[PDB]
Design a binder for these strands. Structure first.
Ligand SMILES: Nc1ncnc2c1ncn2[C@@H]1O[C@H](COP(=O)(O)OP(=O)(O)O)[C@@H](O)[C@H]1O
Ligand SMILES: Nc1ncnc2c1ncn2[C@@H]1O[C@H](COP(=O)(O)OP(=O)(O)O)[C@@H](O)[C@H]1O
Ligand SMILES: [Mg+2]
Ligand SMILES: [Mg+2]
Ligand SMILES: [Zn+2]
Ligand SMILES: [Zn+2]
Lengths: 97, 201, 632, 629
DNA sequence: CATGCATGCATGCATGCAT
DNA sequence: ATGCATGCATGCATGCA
């Protein structure tokens, strides 16, 4: 819930996942996200919706979109001696969707 | 504060909430005295404002006298004038009652004289007073705006502090003769430390 | 319009009683005539009126039987009006300079400032007249009913401005006709006069332009201050409030931040009917006299003589610090030496050495360390108490701020600048961040601070003495670990202390009974047990220490030879233990300097100009006993 | 007025060489021979002469009028002198110039936070350091008006800050009302500048902070004081009412205060003269030596214990530490400065680091070097920031506009910057020094500013070993707590080790204790030492000869013939050697560096870091091989 | 809205102890 | 010898004027 640069007006802006409903979200550098991004992507990929409770606005928004993501392995080189789950930073709950 | 509407203007109401913002107590001028040395005589002027009385009175041209009718110069006698204390506070809907996730509602209250300092911010309060309206929401002006309304506030005449959990105010009861007699009678028994102790939880 | 009302006052009779008092009262000739003679003769810029004198004068006139008026009551109720009445009388009875020198508003001619002094309480009880001007009041008890009266407020100063000029009577001159116009000013802002108003200019068709003349104007000295409430006055669960003070005339520079004071003044008012308020200062009274204001008046000499001639003064003055705390005699001696201090030294070249003593107390829980820093912060005239947690390093040194009164930008100082020429007692020394203690090093050694952050590139001055309290690494003492590792202060910080006491609590069935009896007596009766020892009151002790601080003993050679031998002995004896790792550190020259300073202070307390050898013996004994608990 | 112009007229180790001549007559003659128009006047010379005893006090109370009286008297005396002797040179050009007098050494002050309102419009003196200086402000003295109906023009003069506007044309033919118009670009203007002055703690009572003042300088004393200089000013105390608004004319009762500058003095006896190499493109900047002082300088230059005497004279109250003193002395002189026009540029400034046990007089030495320097700031390590040392962006409170200010390392240009607690200082607050210690420059690129600033100074740093005490159980490079690239820049690294020894213990104890026998106790005084160093810095620039090149190369390859157990030799040891040898040559007033100076350079480098008493293999100190000596 | 200082909260790294 | 827990020191977020 941000402020508009020109109209001095509040705006409820959903992320790329709520803005890509009935479309596709293309995510680059998928392995270098902070806590907020991981939580948002987890909710989107679990329930295909995003909740929000900010500044008097309590609502839910639809995020029925497909996700295509790109990433790089730990250390910058894939190690075939280990399972894929140990070559990437992503945990299992996000890697099972 | 949430359920106060335009239907209740100009009525005596009682409102409970949380004190959110107090002000700095200040004096207000109510009578101004003067001395004229040339004639050796004392004069006095009186002043009034909207929030002094409940009824409406034609405004008077407040002007501080500087020269006597005969022309003799005047000097102020600050010690013989009259001043009355004045505070303004803000009350809000308690967190224990306000709906979750929605911005709360507020109302201003005006206190004066002997009700000017009896509560502190963050306390639970109950104010009994008259809900009033003041000014002109652009009505007098030929062209001011079409998106404003009249200003409202409460002329407090009673304030009570309420005791809650995890709150600053401390509970208190009025003890009667019966209560004191019973306490004194009960304190005689030898097992008192056990009676008062097994009764906890 | 403007009706009239009748009052019992009479501003004619009172002016006559004013003149009678002012030229007929005696405690030598008339009392106030002499003061006016000094004013004429150019030796006095201030005249002060004691209301006790007025009260006594009117009581004597009542004894005479002739009816009079209650002048003091009239002044107490309406005090801003009597200032000019007194000034008028003082301008009609002034003498002519017996010595030699080398219409217009009356204030240009006056060169003196009138101040009223409140009415004492003892005089009131003497003459049965309850005094309203000498009743201290909190900043929260001053309400509208007091506007216009003469009152007193007790508090602690927080902020003070810089003296500035304020114009009371602007003067002008006309180049066309040559007249002089005078404008009086009694507001924060003003509009100047523009065109000439004389008879000639009025008659003529060419009116001249006026010009301000700075030299002829009546410029006064203005300062402003802020005063808060003491924590003993705030109600249960509230926050203290503040109040403003104006100072004009020859009272400027009489209030400094951090000083607990009683200030007397007139409570005067400042689009609405609401109004701001302020106190016009008339008389200040400090609760603890500054040491650097001492004079050997006859009374103070009489008082100090009794202490001098009463035998033991070192033990009497050491047993009198916190007389409700049992034992700890050596600790109290080293803390009494903390107050006096050594003797600073400038070698004439670009070098200087401090003269203050820093002390540290490290001990076990429940040995009354804190309750001795709270008594030392109270005996000292400019004491400060801080706790390790509640501190920031900056909060101790300084930061920036802006002055509301003037427009200058100013630098605000922390607790170590408020304690200048005083004790800065730091509690919980170990628990404050090590990145916050490192700002204390320069203060301890060079007695300065050096700020090089944005906006400010400068230095301060902090002539402070540090009394620190701390605890071992893990609560209680661990005899197994080394003494050095048990404590948690680096060697550099340890060297900067001169006394470091170890108050370990070792139970023993015999001595605990004495402590128990002392404490439980302190509780059953609200005073200390001993009926043979009568502790010196804080005022008499402060007065003696102030007299002692004026000396500057020097040393002979017969003591220098002893000092050198002892230093060699200690510095050789220390290496064995330090290598053995059961030690406290390694002796350095700072140990020698500390011994010298302790000897100087012991010499000063004796009122001597030379350092005896029994002083270097007491100093060495103290530095030895400092660690005589680890060798239990 | 007649009494003043007469009294001043007639006014205008005992020795008799030049003390029996008319002091001001020669000045008046040199002034008319050279075309100068100022005659600095020492006030005490006025107090001395019997006749001008009242005039002194009058000047102390009525400066603005007495100054004009003196100026007119000096002009009249010049005219009388030229006419009386029938001198050949013309007396026409003199009438086309103006003359002034700049009194100084007026009765001392007490502190600007103790002056009362009854001191307004009086002469005073202050001493402080400069922080900021506004650009040139054009002030008006004459106004130019033109007639927009007849094209006639007028010139009006100013009077106490007001201009009078002609209400009617002054021509008879044309007298149209309110027809005049001001033409800004045809008017006349003078210069003005405003400077911030921070007073030194000459005296400050208990608990007060520093106080900053504003000074105004007019006409010819504009852009004469830079930021960082320490000066003594003499001028008038003034007051002014300030307008509360740019539209409304309601004045504020509380008055502002400032000082009008009439004289500024820069040089001081108890410090060196500013380096002359940094003001080449830029008021007595430097002290002037007579031939009698130069004679003493030359005589001292030929003593057999010059290098010992000079070192021992610095900080006379410190005991021994002869090598530390020698290094600091060579620091002050510095190496010769070179100017390239095909390559880059190199400068000789010597940085020194002092590491050692507590209580070894590391702070006292830095305080001495601070007080015997022209420019420099003594800042500890704790109270500093990366910006507070280099430069900041700020807003004035008497304008409300933007400006870049100068930090600690810029206020010390041409001098020495002293830094205590070099170890208890942040790793990022310390990186800004990387550019300032080899490039002698400060590149800034922040919002609205992109520039590079010269900061050409030397560093004197004091640091404690990790764990406070120094234990010879670890390598030397581990007791210190600095990384490689920062520790290579320092030219000298000094180890100050404590050692228990009854002999030195007794000697130092007797030294320290000799200061407490009295309350106020071969060493050349301070002023002569400063004069010597200033002359040497300004005049002698030694050159390198082939005999020394072969020694420098050999000694450096020798240090390189010798992992990470100690400070490995880099290419900056060779340059350190060159600079130290040049400084040693400069001390003796020679103009050629020879073998005996390169040898001193190498000896001092090796002695600094206790190399004669260290094991080359394990790299740890042998406490038995270190002696005070 | 950018600059730079002081408070307070959060995180990640290192060291010590226990299994 | 390895892993886990605790304490400390470095970083960021806020808040500011
Ligand atoms: N020697 C003693 N004499 C009197 N009271 C003591 C003594 N030792 C301890 N006490 C009491 O025990 C308490 C210790 O509190 P405190 O000063 O906080 O101890 P510490 O600061 O050492 O932890 C005090 O209230 C004091 O009354
Ligand atoms: N060689 C010495 N010459 C003179 N004074 C010394 C010497 N060594 C120690 N001192 C004393 O040590 C004190 C200064 O110590 P200081 O320099 O502050 O320690 P540090 O070097 O750790 O900062 C002075 O009071 C001085 O008298
Ligand atoms: Mg405690
Ligand atoms: Mg030091
Ligand atoms: Zn006139
Ligand atoms: Zn014309």
């Amino acid at each position: 819930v941000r402020k508009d640069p020109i109209t001095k007006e509040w705006t409820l802006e959903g992320g790329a996942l709520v803005l890509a409903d009935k479309g596709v979200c293309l995510i680059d550098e998928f392995d270098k996200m902070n806590d907020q991004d991981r939580t948002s992507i987890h909710e989107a990929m679990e329930q295909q919706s995003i909740s929000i409770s900010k500044a008097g606005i309590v609502t839910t928004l639809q995020a029925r979109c497909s996700i295509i993501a790109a990433a790089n392995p730990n250390g910058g080189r894939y190690n075939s001696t280990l399972p894929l789950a140990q070559n990437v930073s992503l945990t299992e709950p996000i890697l099972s969707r | 504060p949430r359920t106060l509407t335009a239907q209740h203007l100009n009525k005596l109401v009682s409102v409970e909430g949380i004190v959110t913002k107090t002000s700095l107590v200040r004096p207000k001028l109510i009578r101004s005295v003067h001395y004229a040395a040339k004639t050796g005589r004392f004069h006095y002027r009186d002043y009034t404002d909207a929030t002094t009385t409940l009824t409406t009175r034609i405004p008077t041209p407040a002007i501080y006298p500087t020269e006597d009718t005969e022309g003799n110069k005047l000097t102020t006698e600050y010690g013989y004038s009259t001043f009355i204390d004045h505070q303004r506070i803000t009350v809000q809907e308690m967190p224990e009652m306000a709906p979750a996730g929605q911005l709360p509602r507020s109302i201003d209250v005006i206190l004066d004289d002997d009700l000017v300092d009896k509560t502190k911010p963050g306390d639970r309060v109950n104010v009994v007073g008259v809900f009033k309206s003041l000014g002109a929401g652009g009505m007098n002006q030929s062209n001011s705006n079409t998106l404003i309304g009249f200003k409202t506030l409460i002329l407090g005449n009673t304030v009570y502090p309420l005791h809650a959990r995890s709150t600053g105010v401390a509970a208190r009861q009025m003890l009667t003769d019966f209560d004191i007699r019973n306490i004194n009678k009960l304190s005689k028994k030898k097992d008192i430390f056990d009676i008062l102790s097994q009764s906890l939880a | 319009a403007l009706p009239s009302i009748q009052l019992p006052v009479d501003y004619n009779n009172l002016f006559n009683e004013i003149t009678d008092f002012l030229v007929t009262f005696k405690q030598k000739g008339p009392k106030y005539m002499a003061m006016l003679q000094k004013v004429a003769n150019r030796e006095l810029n201030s005249v002060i009126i004691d209301l006790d004198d007025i009260l006594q004068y009117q009581n004597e006139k009542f004894l005479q039987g002739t009816q009079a008026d209650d002048l003091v009551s009239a002044i107490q109720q309406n005090a801003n009006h009597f200032t000019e009445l007194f000034c008028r009388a003082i301008d009609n009875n002034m003498p002519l300079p017996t010595k030699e020198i080398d219409l217009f508003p009356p204030n240009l001619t006056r060169r003196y400032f009138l101040y009223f002094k409140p009415l004492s309480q003892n005089c009131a009880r003497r003459y049965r007249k309850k005094a309203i001007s000498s009743k201290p009041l909190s900043v929260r008890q001053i309400k509208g009913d007091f506007l216009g009266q003469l009152i007193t407020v007790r508090g602690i100063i927080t902020r003070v401005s810089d003296v500035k000029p304020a114009v009371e009577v602007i003067a002008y001159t006309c180049d066309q006709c040559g007249y002089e116009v005078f404008q009086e000013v009694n507001s924060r802002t003003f509009t100047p006069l523009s065109e000439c108003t004389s008879e000639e200019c009025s008659q003529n068709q060419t009116k001249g332009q006026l010009f301000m003349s700075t030299r002829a104007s009546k410029f006064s000295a203005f300062q402003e201050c802020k005063i808060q409430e003491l924590s003993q006055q705030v109600p249960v669960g509230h926050i203290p409030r503040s109040l403003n003070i104006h100072v004009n005339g020859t009272l400027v520079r009489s209030l400094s931040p951090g000083d607990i004071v009683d200030v007397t003044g007139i409570f005067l008012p400042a689009a609405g009917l609401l109004t701001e308020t302020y106190l016009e200062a008339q008389f200040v009274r400090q609760h603890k006299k500054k040491f650097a204001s001492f004079s050997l008046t006859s009374d103070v000499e009489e008082r100090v003589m009794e202490l001098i001639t009463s035998g033991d003064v070192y033990n009497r003055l050491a047993k009198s610090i916190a007389p409700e705390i049992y034992g700890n005699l050596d600790v109290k001696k080293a803390l009494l030496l903390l107050l006096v201090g050594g003797v600073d030294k400038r070698v004439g070249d670009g070098m200087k050495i401090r003269g203050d003593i820093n002390v540290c107390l490290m001990g076990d829980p429940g040995v009354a360390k804190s309750q001795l820093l709270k008594a030392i912060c109270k005996i000292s005239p400019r004491g400060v108490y801080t706790t390790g947690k509640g501190s920031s390093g900056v909060g101790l040194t300084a930061a920036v701020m802006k002055d509301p009164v003037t427009d200058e930008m100013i630098l605000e100082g922390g607790a170590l600048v408020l304690a200048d020429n005083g004790i800065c007692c730091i509690d919980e020394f170990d628990k404050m961040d090590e990145s916050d203690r490192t700002a204390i090093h320069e203060v301890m050694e060079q007695q300065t601070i050096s700020i090089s952050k944005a906006g400010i590139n400068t230095t301060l001055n902090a002539r402070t003495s540090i009394l620190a309290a701390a605890n071992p690494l893990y609560g209680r003492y661990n005899p197994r670990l080394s003494p050095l590792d048990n404590i948690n202060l680096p060697a550099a910080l340890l060297s900067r202390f001169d006394i470091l006491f170890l108050m370990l609590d070792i139970p023993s069935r015999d001595d605990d009974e004495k402590l128990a009896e002392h404490v439980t007596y302190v509780h059953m009766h609200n005073k200390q047990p001993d009926l043979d020892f009568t502790p010196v009151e804080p005022s008499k002790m402060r007065e003696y220490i102030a007299y002692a601080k004026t000396k500057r003993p020097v040393m002979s050679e017969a003591v220098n030879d002893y000092v050198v031998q002892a230093y060699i002995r200690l510095r050789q004896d220390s290496k064995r233990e330090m290598d053995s790792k059961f030690s406290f550190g390694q002796a350095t020259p700072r140990t020698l300097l500390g011994i010298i300073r302790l000897s100087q202070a012991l010499a000063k307390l004796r009122l001597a100009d030379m350092v005896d050898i029994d002083d270097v013996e007491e100093a060495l004994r103290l530095v030895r006993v400092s660690k005589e608990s680890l060798y239990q | 007025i007649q009494e003043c112009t007469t009294n001043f007229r007639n006014f205008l180790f005992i020795n008799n060489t030049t003390d029996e001549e008319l002091y001001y007559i020669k000045q008046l003659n040199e002034m008319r021979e050279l075309g100068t128009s100022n005659l600095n006047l020492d006030a005490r010379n006025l107090l001395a002469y019997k006749q001008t005893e009242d005039l002194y006090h009058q000047l102390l109370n009525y400066p603005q009028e007495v100054i004009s009286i003196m100026d007119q008297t000096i002009k009249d005396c010049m005219v009388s002198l030229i006419v009386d002797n029938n001198l050949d040179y013309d007396l026409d050009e003199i009438e086309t110039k103006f003359y002034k007098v700049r009194p100084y050494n007026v009765g001392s002050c007490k502190g600007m936070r103790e002056l009362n309102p009854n001191d307004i419009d009086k002469l005073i003196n202050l001493k402080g350091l400069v922080l900021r200086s506004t650009p040139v402000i054009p002030d008006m003295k004459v106004a130019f008006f033109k007639c927009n109906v007849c094209d006639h023009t007028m010139a009006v003069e100013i009077d106490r800050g007001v201009i009078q506007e002609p209400a009617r044309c002054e021509r008879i033919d044309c007298n149209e009302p309110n027809s005049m118009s001001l033409i800004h670009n045809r008017c006349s203007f003078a210069d003005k500048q405003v400077i911030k002055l921070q007073e030194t703690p000459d005296f400050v009572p208990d608990g007060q902070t520093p106080h900053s003042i504003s000074l105004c300088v007019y006409d010819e004393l504009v852009d004469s004081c830079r930021a960082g200089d320490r000066i003594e000013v003499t001028g008038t105390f003034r007051s002014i009412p300030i307008r509360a608004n740019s539209r409304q004319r309601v004045l504020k009762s509380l008055y502002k205060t400032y000082v009008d500058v009439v004289h500024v003095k820069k040089v001081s006896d108890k410090r060196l003269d500013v380096d002359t190499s940094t003001i080449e493109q830029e008021v007595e900047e430097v002290r002037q030596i007579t031939d009698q002082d130069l004679a003493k300088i030359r005589e001292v230059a030929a003593r057999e214990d010059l290098y010992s005497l000079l070192a021992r004279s610095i900080a006379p109250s410190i005991y021994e530490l002869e090598d530390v003193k020698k290094g600091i002395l060579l620091q002050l002189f510095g190496g010769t400065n070179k100017t390239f026009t095909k390559g880059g540029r190199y400068r000789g400034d010597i940085n020194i680091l002092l590491c050692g046990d507590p209580s070894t007089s590391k702070s006292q030495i830095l305080q001495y070097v601070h007080k015997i320097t022209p420019r420099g700031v003594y800042t500890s390590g704790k109270g500093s920031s990366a910006v507070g040392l280099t430069a900041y962006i700020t807003r004035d409170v008497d304008t409300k506009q933007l400006v870049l200010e100068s930090g600690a390392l810029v206020l010390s240009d041409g001098g020495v910057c002293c830094i205590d607690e070099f170890d208890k200082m942040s790793d990022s607050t310390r990186s800004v020094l990387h550019e300032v210690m080899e490039q002698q420059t400060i590149s800034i690129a922040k919002a609205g500013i992109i520039t590079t600033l010269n900061a050409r100074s030397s560093i004197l740093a004091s640091a404690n070993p990790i764990g406070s005490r120094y234990n010879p159980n670890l390598p030397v490079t581990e007791n210190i707590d600095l990384p490689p690239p920062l520790l290579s820049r320092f030219d000298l690294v000094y180890l100050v080790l404590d050692k228990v020894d009854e002999k030195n213990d007794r000697e130092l104890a007797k030294h320290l204790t000799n200061l407490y026998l009295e309350d106020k106790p071969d060493v050349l005084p301070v002023e002569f030492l400063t004069m010597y160093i200033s002359y040497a810095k300004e005049h002698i620039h030694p050159i390198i000869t082939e005999a020394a090149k072969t020694e420098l190369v050999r000694a450096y390859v020798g240090m390189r013939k010798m992992d990470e157990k100690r400070i490995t030799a880099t290419t900056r040891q060779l340059e350190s050697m060159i600079r130290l040898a040049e400084a040693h040559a400069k001390m003796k007033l020679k103009n050629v560096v020879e073998l005996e100076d390169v040898q001193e350079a190498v000896r001092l480098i090796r002695s600094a870091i206790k190399d004669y008493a260290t094991d080359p293999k394990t790299g740890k100190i042998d406490m038995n091989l270190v002696q005070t000596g």
